[PDB]
Amino acid sequence: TCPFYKKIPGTGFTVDAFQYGVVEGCTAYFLTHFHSDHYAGLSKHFTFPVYCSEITGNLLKNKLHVQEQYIHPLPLDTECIVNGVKVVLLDANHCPGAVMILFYLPNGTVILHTGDFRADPSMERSLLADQKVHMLYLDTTYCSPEYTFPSQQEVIRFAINTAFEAVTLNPHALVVCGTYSIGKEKVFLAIADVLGSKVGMSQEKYKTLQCLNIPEINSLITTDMCSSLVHLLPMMQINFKGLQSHLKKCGGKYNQILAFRPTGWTHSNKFTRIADVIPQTKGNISIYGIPYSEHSSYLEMKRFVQWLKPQKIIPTVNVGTWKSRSTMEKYFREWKLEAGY
Ligand SMILES: CO/N=C(\C(=O)N[C@@H]1C(=O)N2C(C(=O)O)=C(COC(C)=O)CS[C@H]12)c1csc(N)n1
Ligand SMILES: CO/N=C(\C(=O)N[C@@H]1C(=O)N2C(C(=O)O)=C(COC(C)=O)CS[C@H]12)c1csc(N)n1
Ligand code: NI
């Protein structure tokens, strides 16, 4: 049974609702981005129109084998008509191909569905600013003040400087980055760039990255793993045992691994007050937990919502418990009272 927050009222549209069979009344299925929790259910046997970004369409065609006749890629920042309703797709600042959707309802209402997003002040000076938005379907992943983390730029600076120093001190070191989906490509691409290396990876991951329209990416990635100083591994292998086993590969041409894992999103006086990143180390293997996020921090989310001033907010994340629903509604009310909308 499709939850109500996945249906757009006054339309026959659903958003990220592919695991519920045939949704009654749905004439178009929007997919905000290619993450498993959102595309769950899509396959080569889906026979309804899917509306998405071009990059998401590339992944649907090449990774899930969705038939081309049902993939409807839409350009960003462009007014499009879908089944009699004007829509606009905007970059969500999440993972490649991820979009927010503006719906211009026939009754004059405007709805913004953020998909998954990392709110940024740049969104306030975009075409989002050119009309009132009445209802907001909000990515509330980190809707609590303890969710603080640096800008992606600060985190990438840390990772680049850490990896460059380690490999320049020890040219026999290897950098490993963990991955389980698309997104956070900047981490391993930036490290490989500063090291003059390509990123070695599995054929399956290589295929995935080939779908993302990343400029000059043939110059940055390879399936020849031992020829590179940066390797991508499945996230489940980013542990001392998994990295020890990997070090035994490639003829043992490396004697050190620095691994990067995205983690560490909670920081407050209650829990992990110090945000400074220090690796977990065992012998010649170090694992850096870096707070690289592709969701809004609490402050980023708050700023965006107080700028947008929506009349109604419908969370799309963390609404499975009464505690989380209640806390989120308290924050929305706080934000509304502070900003006066
Ligand atoms: C900075 O690292 N943050 C991590 C992570 O990758 N941690 C690591 C890992 O695996 N380790 C193991 C391990 O491999 O078991 C041990 C235990 O070994 C010792 C010290 O003797 C200690 S923590 C380290 C993390 C955050 S969320 C998650 N799933 N992992
Ligand atoms: C308003 O609450 N509506 C719910 C509900 O309990 N919602 C939830 C929420 O948020 N969840 C997330 C979440 O937090 O992300 C996922 C995760 O989903 C995936 C597949 O990633 C699964 S549903 C649970 C509901 C669920 S089924 C139904 N008819 N109503
Ligand atoms: Ni996502």
mmCIF file of C-alpha atoms and ligand atoms in Angstrom:
data_model
loop_
_atom_site.group_PDB
_atom_site.id
_atom_site.type_symbol
_atom_site.label_atom_id
_atom_site.label_comp_id
_atom_site.label_asym_id
_atom_site.label_seq_id
_atom_site.Cartn_x
_atom_site.Cartn_y
_atom_site.Cartn_z
ATOM 1 C CA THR A 1 0.000 0.000 0.000
ATOM 2 C CA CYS A 2 1.547 3.240 -1.255
ATOM 3 C CA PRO A 3 1.974 5.767 1.602
ATOM 4 C CA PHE A 4 0.049 9.002 1.169
ATOM 5 C CA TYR A 5 3.189 11.151 1.093
ATOM 6 C CA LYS A 6 4.194 9.493 -2.193
ATOM 7 C CA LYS A 7 1.088 10.775 -4.022
ATOM 8 C CA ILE A 8 0.805 14.328 -5.375
ATOM 9 C CA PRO A 9 -2.794 15.556 -4.883
ATOM 10 C CA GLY A 10 -4.712 16.909 -7.859
ATOM 11 C CA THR A 11 -2.550 14.855 -10.235
ATOM 12 C CA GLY A 12 -2.175 11.210 -11.094
ATOM 13 C CA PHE A 13 1.476 11.413 -10.065
ATOM 14 C CA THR A 14 3.497 9.415 -7.575
ATOM 15 C CA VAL A 15 7.084 10.046 -6.515
ATOM 16 C CA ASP A 16 9.497 7.159 -5.830
ATOM 17 C CA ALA A 17 6.626 4.642 -5.558
ATOM 18 C CA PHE A 18 7.717 1.538 -7.481
ATOM 19 C CA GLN A 19 7.430 -1.179 -4.804
ATOM 20 C CA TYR A 20 3.630 -1.122 -4.419
ATOM 21 C CA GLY A 21 2.529 -2.811 -7.637
ATOM 22 C CA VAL A 22 0.056 -0.864 -9.749
ATOM 23 C CA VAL A 23 -0.823 2.265 -7.773
ATOM 24 C CA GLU A 24 -4.500 2.927 -8.474
ATOM 25 C CA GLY A 25 -4.962 6.161 -10.404
ATOM 26 C CA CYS A 26 -1.268 6.794 -11.053
ATOM 27 C CA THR A 27 -0.701 7.871 -14.655
ATOM 28 C CA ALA A 28 2.981 8.811 -14.259
ATOM 29 C CA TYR A 29 5.681 7.524 -11.900
ATOM 30 C CA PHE A 30 8.413 10.026 -11.041
ATOM 31 C CA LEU A 31 11.820 8.783 -9.853
ATOM 32 C CA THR A 32 13.838 11.462 -8.067
ATOM 33 C CA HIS A 33 17.165 9.571 -8.111
ATOM 34 C CA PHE A 34 18.844 6.181 -8.514
ATOM 35 C CA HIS A 35 19.070 5.020 -4.894
ATOM 36 C CA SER A 36 17.725 1.598 -3.959
ATOM 37 C CA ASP A 37 15.144 2.757 -1.403
ATOM 38 C CA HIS A 38 13.598 4.996 -4.076
ATOM 39 C CA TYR A 39 13.692 2.834 -7.216
ATOM 40 C CA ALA A 40 12.844 -0.408 -5.328
ATOM 41 C CA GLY A 41 10.521 -2.409 -7.584
ATOM 42 C CA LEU A 42 11.692 -1.101 -10.955
ATOM 43 C CA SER A 43 12.841 -3.749 -13.423
ATOM 44 C CA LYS A 44 12.803 -4.700 -17.095
ATOM 45 C CA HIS A 45 9.177 -5.779 -16.507
ATOM 46 C CA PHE A 46 7.859 -2.339 -15.540
ATOM 47 C CA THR A 47 5.367 -1.116 -18.166
ATOM 48 C CA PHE A 48 4.326 2.375 -17.018
ATOM 49 C CA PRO A 49 5.922 5.731 -17.906
ATOM 50 C CA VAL A 50 8.847 6.715 -15.675
ATOM 51 C CA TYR A 51 9.787 10.388 -15.468
ATOM 52 C CA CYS A 52 13.286 11.201 -14.265
ATOM 53 C CA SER A 53 16.486 13.023 -15.108
ATOM 54 C CA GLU A 54 18.613 11.956 -18.062
ATOM 55 C CA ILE A 55 21.278 10.499 -15.764
ATOM 56 C CA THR A 56 18.666 8.535 -13.806
ATOM 57 C CA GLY A 57 17.306 7.320 -17.137
ATOM 58 C CA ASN A 58 20.794 6.170 -18.154
ATOM 59 C CA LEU A 59 20.948 4.074 -14.992
ATOM 60 C CA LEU A 60 17.416 2.709 -15.435
ATOM 61 C CA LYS A 61 18.306 1.575 -18.951
ATOM 62 C CA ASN A 62 21.800 0.227 -18.300
ATOM 63 C CA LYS A 63 21.610 -1.076 -14.705
ATOM 64 C CA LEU A 64 17.959 -2.147 -14.257
ATOM 65 C CA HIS A 65 17.252 -2.869 -17.953
ATOM 66 C CA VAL A 66 14.030 -0.868 -17.910
ATOM 67 C CA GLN A 67 12.702 -0.764 -21.456
ATOM 68 C CA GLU A 68 13.474 2.464 -23.303
ATOM 69 C CA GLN A 69 9.833 3.031 -24.308
ATOM 70 C CA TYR A 70 8.938 3.653 -20.647
ATOM 71 C CA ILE A 71 11.853 5.959 -19.760
ATOM 72 C CA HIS A 72 10.956 9.652 -20.077
ATOM 73 C CA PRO A 73 14.061 11.720 -19.299
ATOM 74 C CA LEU A 74 13.415 15.396 -18.663
ATOM 75 C CA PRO A 75 15.966 18.218 -18.844
ATOM 76 C CA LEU A 76 16.677 20.215 -15.715
ATOM 77 C CA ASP A 77 15.488 23.805 -15.181
ATOM 78 C CA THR A 78 12.991 23.442 -18.038
ATOM 79 C CA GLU A 79 9.223 23.833 -17.953
ATOM 80 C CA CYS A 80 7.723 20.549 -19.164
ATOM 81 C CA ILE A 81 4.141 19.333 -19.460
ATOM 82 C CA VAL A 82 3.464 15.841 -18.098
ATOM 83 C CA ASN A 83 -0.115 14.565 -18.476
ATOM 84 C CA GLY A 84 -1.467 18.110 -18.519
ATOM 85 C CA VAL A 85 0.550 19.383 -15.528
ATOM 86 C CA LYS A 86 3.505 21.764 -15.715
ATOM 87 C CA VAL A 87 6.587 20.421 -13.914
ATOM 88 C CA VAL A 88 10.211 21.520 -13.496
ATOM 89 C CA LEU A 89 13.151 19.363 -12.401
ATOM 90 C CA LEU A 90 15.879 21.040 -10.327
ATOM 91 C CA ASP A 91 19.243 19.699 -9.199
ATOM 92 C CA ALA A 92 18.843 18.275 -5.699
ATOM 93 C CA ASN A 93 22.543 18.512 -4.718
ATOM 94 C CA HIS A 94 22.339 14.876 -3.689
ATOM 95 C CA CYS A 95 23.830 12.190 -5.966
ATOM 96 C CA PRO A 96 24.283 12.333 -9.770
ATOM 97 C CA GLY A 97 20.979 12.652 -11.576
ATOM 98 C CA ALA A 98 19.065 13.437 -8.371
ATOM 99 C CA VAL A 99 16.288 16.014 -8.739
ATOM 100 C CA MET A 100 13.709 17.999 -6.844
ATOM 101 C CA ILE A 101 10.367 18.338 -8.648
ATOM 102 C CA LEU A 102 8.245 21.494 -8.864
ATOM 103 C CA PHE A 103 4.579 20.713 -9.596
ATOM 104 C CA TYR A 104 2.374 23.566 -10.795
ATOM 105 C CA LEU A 105 -1.052 22.229 -9.875
ATOM 106 C CA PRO A 106 -4.103 23.123 -11.992
ATOM 107 C CA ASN A 107 -5.734 24.865 -9.005
ATOM 108 C CA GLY A 108 -2.825 27.343 -8.797
ATOM 109 C CA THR A 109 -1.043 25.515 -5.956
ATOM 110 C CA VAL A 110 2.706 24.956 -6.303
ATOM 111 C CA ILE A 111 4.307 21.881 -4.706
ATOM 112 C CA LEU A 112 8.032 21.264 -4.243
ATOM 113 C CA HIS A 113 9.127 17.659 -3.722
ATOM 114 C CA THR A 114 12.771 17.700 -2.682
ATOM 115 C CA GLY A 115 13.415 14.022 -3.277
ATOM 116 C CA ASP A 116 16.623 13.501 -1.357
ATOM 117 C CA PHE A 117 18.558 16.757 -1.225
ATOM 118 C CA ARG A 118 21.278 18.666 0.552
ATOM 119 C CA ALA A 119 19.834 22.151 0.929
ATOM 120 C CA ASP A 120 22.144 24.934 -0.222
ATOM 121 C CA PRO A 121 21.739 28.740 -0.301
ATOM 122 C CA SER A 122 22.213 28.510 -4.079
ATOM 123 C CA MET A 123 18.705 27.046 -4.279
ATOM 124 C CA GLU A 124 17.322 30.350 -2.925
ATOM 125 C CA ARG A 125 18.610 32.249 -5.964
ATOM 126 C CA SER A 126 17.333 29.673 -8.482
ATOM 127 C CA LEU A 127 14.010 29.554 -10.297
ATOM 128 C CA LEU A 128 12.552 28.281 -7.014
ATOM 129 C CA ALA A 129 12.476 31.989 -6.060
ATOM 130 C CA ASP A 130 10.209 32.995 -8.961
ATOM 131 C CA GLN A 131 6.898 31.661 -7.584
ATOM 132 C CA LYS A 132 5.301 30.973 -4.224
ATOM 133 C CA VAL A 133 5.578 27.354 -3.090
ATOM 134 C CA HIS A 134 2.615 26.221 -1.001
ATOM 135 C CA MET A 135 3.414 22.630 -0.034
ATOM 136 C CA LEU A 136 6.815 21.054 0.583
ATOM 137 C CA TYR A 137 7.545 17.316 0.491
ATOM 138 C CA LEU A 138 10.740 17.407 2.539
ATOM 139 C CA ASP A 139 13.788 15.145 2.878
ATOM 140 C CA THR A 140 13.923 15.127 6.684
ATOM 141 C CA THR A 141 16.790 12.630 7.006
ATOM 142 C CA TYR A 142 18.685 14.785 9.552
ATOM 143 C CA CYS A 143 15.895 16.898 11.091
ATOM 144 C CA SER A 144 17.436 17.254 14.541
ATOM 145 C CA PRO A 145 20.008 19.810 15.767
ATOM 146 C CA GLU A 146 22.612 17.208 16.729
ATOM 147 C CA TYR A 147 23.105 16.518 12.995
ATOM 148 C CA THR A 148 25.956 18.890 12.267
ATOM 149 C CA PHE A 149 28.693 18.233 9.755
ATOM 150 C CA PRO A 150 31.067 20.358 7.667
ATOM 151 C CA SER A 151 30.604 21.497 4.118
ATOM 152 C CA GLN A 152 31.542 18.945 1.489
ATOM 153 C CA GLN A 153 34.414 21.282 0.586
ATOM 154 C CA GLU A 154 35.930 21.066 4.073
ATOM 155 C CA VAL A 155 35.599 17.279 4.077
ATOM 156 C CA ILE A 156 37.169 16.920 0.626
ATOM 157 C CA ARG A 157 40.002 19.237 1.692
ATOM 158 C CA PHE A 158 40.611 16.947 4.676
ATOM 159 C CA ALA A 159 40.562 13.812 2.525
ATOM 160 C CA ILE A 160 42.810 15.228 -0.229
ATOM 161 C CA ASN A 161 45.345 16.596 2.258
ATOM 162 C CA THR A 162 45.315 13.371 4.290
ATOM 163 C CA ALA A 163 45.768 11.120 1.265
ATOM 164 C CA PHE A 164 48.389 13.286 -0.451
ATOM 165 C CA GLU A 165 50.529 13.547 2.681
ATOM 166 C CA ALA A 166 50.301 9.810 3.356
ATOM 167 C CA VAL A 167 51.207 8.748 -0.182
ATOM 168 C CA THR A 168 53.951 11.368 -0.496
ATOM 169 C CA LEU A 169 55.509 10.160 2.769
ATOM 170 C CA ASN A 170 55.007 6.505 1.727
ATOM 171 C CA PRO A 171 54.793 5.997 -2.057
ATOM 172 C CA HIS A 172 53.904 2.354 -1.324
ATOM 173 C CA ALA A 173 50.624 3.341 0.361
ATOM 174 C CA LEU A 174 47.224 2.563 -1.161
ATOM 175 C CA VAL A 175 44.054 4.618 -0.753
ATOM 176 C CA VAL A 176 40.742 2.753 -0.556
ATOM 177 C CA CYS A 177 37.288 4.348 -0.663
ATOM 178 C CA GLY A 178 34.131 2.426 0.158
ATOM 179 C CA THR A 179 30.936 2.637 -1.875
ATOM 180 C CA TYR A 180 27.561 0.915 -2.096
ATOM 181 C CA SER A 181 25.584 3.165 -4.484
ATOM 182 C CA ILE A 182 26.043 6.235 -6.628
ATOM 183 C CA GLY A 183 26.906 9.462 -4.849
ATOM 184 C CA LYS A 184 29.969 10.845 -3.064
ATOM 185 C CA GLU A 185 32.084 10.355 -6.202
ATOM 186 C CA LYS A 186 33.857 13.613 -5.348
ATOM 187 C CA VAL A 187 35.707 11.834 -2.518
ATOM 188 C CA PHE A 188 37.543 9.279 -4.613
ATOM 189 C CA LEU A 189 37.788 11.458 -7.729
ATOM 190 C CA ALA A 190 39.371 14.342 -5.800
ATOM 191 C CA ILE A 191 41.864 12.027 -4.072
ATOM 192 C CA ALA A 192 42.843 10.355 -7.341
ATOM 193 C CA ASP A 193 43.195 13.776 -8.967
ATOM 194 C CA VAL A 194 45.680 15.041 -6.372
ATOM 195 C CA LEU A 195 47.620 11.759 -6.599
ATOM 196 C CA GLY A 196 47.845 11.741 -10.401
ATOM 197 C CA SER A 197 46.100 8.370 -10.341
ATOM 198 C CA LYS A 198 43.056 6.727 -11.810
ATOM 199 C CA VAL A 199 40.492 5.045 -9.578
ATOM 200 C CA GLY A 200 40.478 1.255 -9.850
ATOM 201 C CA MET A 201 37.145 -0.493 -9.419
ATOM 202 C CA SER A 202 35.032 -3.494 -10.347
ATOM 203 C CA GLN A 203 33.484 -3.783 -13.789
ATOM 204 C CA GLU A 204 30.015 -3.303 -12.277
ATOM 205 C CA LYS A 205 31.013 -0.064 -10.531
ATOM 206 C CA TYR A 206 32.814 1.101 -13.677
ATOM 207 C CA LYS A 207 29.623 0.588 -15.691
ATOM 208 C CA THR A 208 27.653 2.565 -13.115
ATOM 209 C CA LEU A 209 30.004 5.553 -13.228
ATOM 210 C CA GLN A 210 29.898 5.460 -17.036
ATOM 211 C CA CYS A 211 26.178 6.336 -16.788
ATOM 212 C CA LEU A 212 26.643 9.591 -14.854
ATOM 213 C CA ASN A 213 27.776 12.067 -17.571
ATOM 214 C CA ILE A 214 30.861 13.024 -15.535
ATOM 215 C CA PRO A 215 33.215 15.134 -17.700
ATOM 216 C CA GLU A 216 36.576 13.555 -18.530
ATOM 217 C CA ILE A 217 35.765 10.503 -16.419
ATOM 218 C CA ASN A 218 37.455 8.078 -18.821
ATOM 219 C CA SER A 219 40.636 9.854 -17.686
ATOM 220 C CA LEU A 220 39.786 9.216 -14.016
ATOM 221 C CA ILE A 221 38.533 5.621 -13.654
ATOM 222 C CA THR A 222 39.741 2.174 -14.692
ATOM 223 C CA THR A 223 39.038 -1.522 -14.272
ATOM 224 C CA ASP A 224 42.828 -2.076 -14.082
ATOM 225 C CA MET A 225 43.010 -2.033 -10.303
ATOM 226 C CA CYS A 226 46.689 -2.739 -9.631
ATOM 227 C CA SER A 227 47.631 0.160 -11.944
ATOM 228 C CA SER A 228 46.088 2.730 -9.576
ATOM 229 C CA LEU A 229 46.770 4.291 -6.168
ATOM 230 C CA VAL A 230 43.057 4.607 -5.327
ATOM 231 C CA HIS A 231 40.750 1.580 -5.193
ATOM 232 C CA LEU A 232 36.978 1.503 -4.738
ATOM 233 C CA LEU A 233 35.680 -1.388 -2.659
ATOM 234 C CA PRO A 234 32.186 -2.347 -1.513
ATOM 235 C CA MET A 235 31.463 -0.535 1.736
ATOM 236 C CA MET A 236 31.004 -3.852 3.555
ATOM 237 C CA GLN A 237 34.718 -4.545 3.002
ATOM 238 C CA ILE A 238 35.861 -1.335 4.768
ATOM 239 C CA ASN A 239 36.979 -3.036 7.978
ATOM 240 C CA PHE A 240 40.301 -4.332 9.238
ATOM 241 C CA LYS A 241 39.722 -7.901 8.008
ATOM 242 C CA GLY A 242 38.430 -6.834 4.594
ATOM 243 C CA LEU A 243 41.281 -4.377 4.097
ATOM 244 C CA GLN A 244 43.914 -6.851 5.331
ATOM 245 C CA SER A 245 42.648 -9.311 2.722
ATOM 246 C CA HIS A 246 42.740 -6.634 0.015
ATOM 247 C CA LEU A 247 46.313 -5.683 0.940
ATOM 248 C CA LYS A 248 47.343 -9.266 0.128
ATOM 249 C CA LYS A 249 46.242 -8.589 -3.469
ATOM 250 C CA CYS A 250 48.095 -7.046 -6.433
ATOM 251 C CA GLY A 251 51.241 -9.007 -5.626
ATOM 252 C CA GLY A 252 51.531 -7.256 -2.270
ATOM 253 C CA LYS A 253 52.847 -4.137 -4.003
ATOM 254 C CA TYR A 254 51.378 -1.972 -1.215
ATOM 255 C CA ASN A 255 52.397 -1.929 2.451
ATOM 256 C CA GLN A 256 49.811 0.510 3.835
ATOM 257 C CA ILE A 257 46.125 1.269 3.334
ATOM 258 C CA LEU A 258 44.353 4.497 4.164
ATOM 259 C CA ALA A 259 40.634 3.882 3.782
ATOM 260 C CA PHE A 260 37.809 6.411 3.766
ATOM 261 C CA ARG A 261 34.267 5.601 4.959
ATOM 262 C CA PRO A 262 31.459 8.210 5.125
ATOM 263 C CA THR A 263 30.193 8.296 8.718
ATOM 264 C CA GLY A 264 30.051 10.481 11.818
ATOM 265 C CA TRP A 265 26.951 12.641 11.389
ATOM 266 C CA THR A 266 26.079 13.208 15.072
ATOM 267 C CA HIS A 267 27.952 15.813 17.139
ATOM 268 C CA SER A 268 26.676 17.509 20.289
ATOM 269 C CA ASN A 269 27.543 17.986 23.946
ATOM 270 C CA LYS A 270 25.726 14.668 24.455
ATOM 271 C CA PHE A 271 27.604 12.574 21.874
ATOM 272 C CA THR A 272 30.965 12.949 20.075
ATOM 273 C CA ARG A 273 31.526 16.594 20.983
ATOM 274 C CA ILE A 274 34.858 16.744 19.124
ATOM 275 C CA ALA A 275 34.241 16.650 15.365
ATOM 276 C CA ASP A 276 37.957 16.243 14.502
ATOM 277 C CA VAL A 277 38.454 13.084 12.426
ATOM 278 C CA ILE A 278 41.007 10.550 13.722
ATOM 279 C CA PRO A 279 41.431 7.149 12.026
ATOM 280 C CA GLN A 280 40.809 3.743 13.507
ATOM 281 C CA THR A 281 44.197 2.080 13.054
ATOM 282 C CA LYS A 282 45.419 -1.514 13.262
ATOM 283 C CA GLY A 283 48.975 -2.076 12.115
ATOM 284 C CA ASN A 284 49.413 -0.670 8.613
ATOM 285 C CA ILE A 285 45.671 -0.126 8.004
ATOM 286 C CA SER A 286 43.922 3.126 8.918
ATOM 287 C CA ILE A 287 40.220 3.851 8.383
ATOM 288 C CA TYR A 288 39.082 7.493 8.302
ATOM 289 C CA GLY A 289 35.428 8.081 9.096
ATOM 290 C CA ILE A 290 34.679 11.303 7.247
ATOM 291 C CA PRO A 291 31.356 13.174 7.567
ATOM 292 C CA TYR A 292 30.704 13.563 3.839
ATOM 293 C CA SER A 293 26.926 13.917 3.540
ATOM 294 C CA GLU A 294 24.595 14.285 0.590
ATOM 295 C CA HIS A 295 21.656 15.215 2.848
ATOM 296 C CA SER A 296 20.937 18.563 4.509
ATOM 297 C CA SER A 297 22.394 19.226 7.908
ATOM 298 C CA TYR A 298 19.824 20.454 10.417
ATOM 299 C CA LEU A 299 20.915 24.075 9.959
ATOM 300 C CA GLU A 300 20.924 23.778 6.154
ATOM 301 C CA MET A 301 17.429 22.268 6.174
ATOM 302 C CA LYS A 302 16.173 24.944 8.563
ATOM 303 C CA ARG A 303 17.573 27.786 6.468
ATOM 304 C CA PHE A 304 16.009 26.420 3.267
ATOM 305 C CA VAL A 305 12.571 25.926 4.809
ATOM 306 C CA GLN A 306 12.586 29.336 6.490
ATOM 307 C CA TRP A 307 13.470 30.904 3.150
ATOM 308 C CA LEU A 308 10.849 28.954 1.206
ATOM 309 C CA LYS A 309 8.126 29.608 3.822
ATOM 310 C CA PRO A 310 5.846 26.723 2.772
ATOM 311 C CA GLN A 311 2.282 26.642 4.040
ATOM 312 C CA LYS A 312 2.477 22.896 4.708
ATOM 313 C CA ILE A 313 5.383 20.459 5.122
ATOM 314 C CA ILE A 314 5.067 16.732 4.437
ATOM 315 C CA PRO A 315 8.150 14.793 5.589
ATOM 316 C CA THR A 316 9.208 11.890 3.382
ATOM 317 C CA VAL A 317 11.875 10.409 5.711
ATOM 318 C CA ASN A 318 11.721 9.223 9.333
ATOM 319 C CA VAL A 319 7.910 9.209 9.581
ATOM 320 C CA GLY A 320 7.770 5.573 10.737
ATOM 321 C CA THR A 321 7.782 6.367 14.480
ATOM 322 C CA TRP A 322 5.580 8.645 16.551
ATOM 323 C CA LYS A 323 8.629 10.089 18.296
ATOM 324 C CA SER A 324 10.218 11.169 15.015
ATOM 325 C CA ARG A 325 6.975 12.536 13.548
ATOM 326 C CA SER A 326 6.378 14.498 16.761
ATOM 327 C CA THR A 327 9.896 15.918 16.986
ATOM 328 C CA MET A 328 9.874 16.975 13.320
ATOM 329 C CA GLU A 329 6.535 18.785 13.658
ATOM 330 C CA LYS A 330 7.888 20.617 16.710
ATOM 331 C CA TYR A 331 10.859 21.850 14.692
ATOM 332 C CA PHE A 332 8.655 22.959 11.795
ATOM 333 C CA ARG A 333 6.536 24.970 14.226
ATOM 334 C CA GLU A 334 9.657 26.494 15.813
ATOM 335 C CA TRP A 335 10.938 27.479 12.376
ATOM 336 C CA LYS A 336 7.584 28.917 11.334
ATOM 337 C CA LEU A 337 7.263 30.992 14.516
ATOM 338 C CA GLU A 338 10.829 32.305 14.329
ATOM 339 C CA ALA A 339 10.587 33.356 10.666
ATOM 340 C CA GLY A 340 6.979 34.549 10.864
ATOM 341 C CA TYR A 341 5.245 32.610 8.091
HETATM 342 C C1 LIG B 1 36.569 5.209 11.546
HETATM 343 O O1 LIG B 1 35.832 3.997 11.343
HETATM 344 N N1 LIG B 1 34.416 4.044 11.447
HETATM 345 C C2 LIG B 1 33.859 2.967 11.063
HETATM 346 C C3 LIG B 1 34.713 1.799 10.656
HETATM 347 O O2 LIG B 1 34.915 1.568 9.487
HETATM 348 N N2 LIG B 1 35.308 1.369 11.700
HETATM 349 C C4 LIG B 1 36.157 0.257 11.784
HETATM 350 C C5 LIG B 1 36.056 -1.204 11.501
HETATM 351 O O3 LIG B 1 35.511 -1.873 10.728
HETATM 352 N N3 LIG B 1 36.742 -1.454 12.615
HETATM 353 C C6 LIG B 1 36.968 -2.545 13.445
HETATM 354 C C7 LIG B 1 36.766 -3.902 12.832
HETATM 355 O O4 LIG B 1 37.210 -4.091 11.881
HETATM 356 O O5 LIG B 1 36.191 -4.651 13.452
HETATM 357 C C8 LIG B 1 37.300 -2.398 14.755
HETATM 358 C C9 LIG B 1 37.689 -3.414 15.826
HETATM 359 O O6 LIG B 1 39.116 -3.818 15.917
HETATM 360 C C10 LIG B 1 40.061 -3.522 16.922
HETATM 361 C C11 LIG B 1 40.356 -2.115 17.169
HETATM 362 O O7 LIG B 1 40.715 -4.304 17.537
HETATM 363 C C12 LIG B 1 37.314 -1.030 15.358
HETATM 364 S S1 LIG B 1 36.418 0.303 14.548
HETATM 365 C C13 LIG B 1 37.032 -0.061 12.902
HETATM 366 C C14 LIG B 1 32.437 2.719 10.967
HETATM 367 C C15 LIG B 1 31.465 3.603 11.257
HETATM 368 S S2 LIG B 1 29.969 2.923 10.890
HETATM 369 C C16 LIG B 1 30.735 1.434 10.505
HETATM 370 N N4 LIG B 1 29.993 0.410 10.147
HETATM 371 N N5 LIG B 1 32.014 1.496 10.543
HETATM 372 C C1 LIG B 2 3.290 8.675 7.487
HETATM 373 O O1 LIG B 2 3.815 7.381 7.712
HETATM 374 N N1 LIG B 2 3.586 6.582 6.635
HETATM 375 C C2 LIG B 2 4.119 5.428 6.725
HETATM 376 C C3 LIG B 2 5.250 5.108 7.562
HETATM 377 O O2 LIG B 2 5.046 4.506 8.579
HETATM 378 N N2 LIG B 2 6.433 5.524 7.058
HETATM 379 C C4 LIG B 2 7.863 5.381 7.055
HETATM 380 C C5 LIG B 2 9.078 6.278 6.817
HETATM 381 O O3 LIG B 2 9.322 7.448 6.802
HETATM 382 N N3 LIG B 2 9.752 5.181 6.377
HETATM 383 C C6 LIG B 2 10.826 5.030 5.613
HETATM 384 C C7 LIG B 2 11.957 6.046 5.838
HETATM 385 O O4 LIG B 2 12.068 6.503 6.859
HETATM 386 O O5 LIG B 2 12.685 6.209 4.965
HETATM 387 C C8 LIG B 2 10.883 3.931 4.860
HETATM 388 C C9 LIG B 2 11.983 3.612 4.147
HETATM 389 O O6 LIG B 2 11.579 3.287 2.839
HETATM 390 C C10 LIG B 2 12.507 2.833 2.057
HETATM 391 C C11 LIG B 2 11.940 1.745 1.210
HETATM 392 O O7 LIG B 2 13.670 3.272 2.120
HETATM 393 C C12 LIG B 2 9.895 2.824 4.842
HETATM 394 S S1 LIG B 2 8.280 3.407 5.284
HETATM 395 C C13 LIG B 2 8.770 4.197 6.797
HETATM 396 C C14 LIG B 2 3.644 4.343 5.866
HETATM 397 C C15 LIG B 2 4.427 3.350 5.421
HETATM 398 S S2 LIG B 2 3.550 2.228 4.487
HETATM 399 C C16 LIG B 2 2.178 3.289 4.636
HETATM 400 N N4 LIG B 2 1.034 3.060 3.926
HETATM 401 N N5 LIG B 2 2.344 4.318 5.427
HETATM 402 NI NI NI B 3 19.262 9.112 -1.844
#
